């Protein structure tokens, strides 16, 4: 109705797959001749050109070119297979995310950077790329960004093949995880009477499962072992009664993270001390409300405290994200300056992460309005601020796209996943 505009080549293509494959294997078993390396390199170039064909993706995925892509991912082969992934990805995202996440399955700063580079380059589709009006899109740390990317990749991995109830439950849990971790990382933690959306005889249009799904998700968040007896007690679309739900929440509260559990709507409707102050993220946000600070002696002593804590042998579970941007924006005391100096010097001392965050935040710039190692670690390399910010904007565009796509599919099918209300509300605010 709307748009009426819209083989032997494939068999020869399969022959080409076999031949180029055996040649790649020969290049691998003869990984001593840069000549043969380069030959098969341009070969895979021609391959990528061919696999750029739309319907050929069938023959591609059937031949298993991912095995070669993995055995390949030399700088020549590196840049080659990178371009290769880009070409193979533009049209088809599934096997893209798949081979990527499985190569991931096969974490130093080097590994993290290699991975994020492969992502940020190889998978830049129209879905991931769009505009942004420069709202205060905050920073993040490396490990958190990496976890967000892995979740996004799993989502897109399963987001096309959709018993069928099993696939539905899997996809629901997947998107729930992605939105959960995204809200966390990016740090975003009576109704009016029924009026018709259309009116500016009685109107035949003007006149729970989601709760159970969310409960089941939280249950699956428990250990599989300790859930095996919980599984038996249960014995996944069995409706519940409020009493059974209260029992469930009570028995789950005993195992163990749960700051979001406590802040959830499901409960609304239904050393070791350091461990306590940590696990209770209410004490985390309380650390934030304390740092919210004339507070000369208090702030000075607390900075000394968190500093002696900054060489703690463990317990980096601390947020370590807001621990920078407030002071970085704040700065007239000589003690103020020296405190900021100790602050940075400790910050870039254990994990380069938040130091890199400062770098992206403009650290080596403020190291000019100034004392030495600050800038030394600040402009150690700015070859990553662009990449980190790129990964942030990309992941956000991708998740907003998944949201829109779900709204459209449910329009088509005439029929609620976890946390979707949270995301929709906080995006509409």
Resolution number, Å:
3.4
- Dihedral sign (CA 385, 386, 388, 393): positive
Neighbours of 412 (CB within 10 A): 7
What's the token pair of residue 261? 């559990």
- Dihedral sign (CA 146, 147, 148, 149): positive
DSSP string, 315-370: -TTS--STTTHHHHHH---HHHHHHHHHHHHHHHHH-HHHHHHHHHHTHHHHTT--
In 3-state terms, what secondary structure has residue 96? Answer: helix
Buried b (16+ CB within 10 A) or exposed e, 204-235: eeeeeeebbbbbbbbbebeeeeebeebeeeee
3-state helix, strand, coil in the chain (%, to 5): 70, 0, 30
In 3-state terms, what secondary structure has residue 16? Answer: helix
């Amino acid at each position: 109705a709307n748009c009426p505009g819209l083989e032997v080549a494939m068999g020869e293509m399969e022959a080409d797959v076999q031949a180029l494959v055996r040649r790649a294997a020969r290049q691998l078993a003869e990984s001593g001749t840069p000549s043969l390396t380069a030959a098969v390199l341009h070969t895979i170039h021609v391959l990528s050109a061919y696999a750029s064909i739309g319907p050929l993706t069938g023959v591609f995925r059937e031949t298993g070119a991912l095995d070669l892509l993995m055995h390949m991912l030399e700088p020549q082969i590196r840049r080659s297979a990178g371009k290769m992934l880009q070409a193979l990805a533009a049209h088809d995202a599934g096997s893209r995310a798949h081979v990527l996440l499985s190569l991931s399955q096969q974490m130093d700063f080097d590994s993290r950077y290699t991975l994020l580079e492969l992502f940020a380059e190889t998978t830049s589709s129209e879905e991931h790329c769009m505009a942004f009006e420069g709202i205060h899109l905050p920073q993040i740390p490396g490990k958190l960004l990496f976890s967000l990317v892995k979740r996004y990749l799993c989502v897109t991995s399963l987001l096309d093949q959709l018993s069928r109830g099993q696939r539905e439950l899997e996809f629901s849990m997947a998107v729930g995880n992605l939105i959960s971790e995204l809200v966390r990382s990016m740090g975003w933690a009576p109704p009016r009477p029924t009026r018709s959306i259309f009116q500016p005889y009685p109107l035949p249009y003007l006149q729970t499962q989601a709760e159970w799904w969310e409960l089941l998700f939280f249950i699956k968040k428990l250990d599989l072992c300790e859930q095996q007896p919980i599984f038996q007690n249960l014995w996944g679309e069995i409706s519940v009664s409020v009493e059974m739900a209260e029992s469930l929440l009570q028995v789950l509260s005993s195992r163990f993270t749960l700051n979001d559990l406590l802040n959830s709507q499901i409960y609304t409707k239904y050393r070791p001390l350091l461990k306590r102050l940590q696990q209770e993220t209410q004490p985390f946000l309380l650390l934030l409300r304390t740092l919210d600070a004339p507070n000369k002696t208090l702030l000075l002593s607390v900075l000394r405290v968190i500093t002696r804590l900054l060489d703690f042998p463990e317990a980096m579970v601390l947020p370590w994200h807001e621990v920078l941007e407030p002071c970085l924006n704040c700065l007239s005391d000589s003690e103020i300056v020296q405190e900021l100096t100790c602050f940075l010097h400790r910050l870039a001392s254990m994990h380069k992460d938040y130091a890199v965050v400062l770098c992206c935040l403009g650290a080596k710039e403020i190291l000019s309005k100034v004392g030495c190692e600050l800038r030394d670690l600040v402009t150690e390399c700015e070859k990553y601020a662009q990449l980190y910010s790129n990964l942030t904007s990309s992941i956000l565009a991708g998740c907003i796209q998944m949201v829109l796509g779900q709204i459209e599919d449910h329009r088509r099918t005439h029929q609620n996943i976890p946390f979707f209300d949270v995301f929709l509300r906080h995006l509409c605010q």
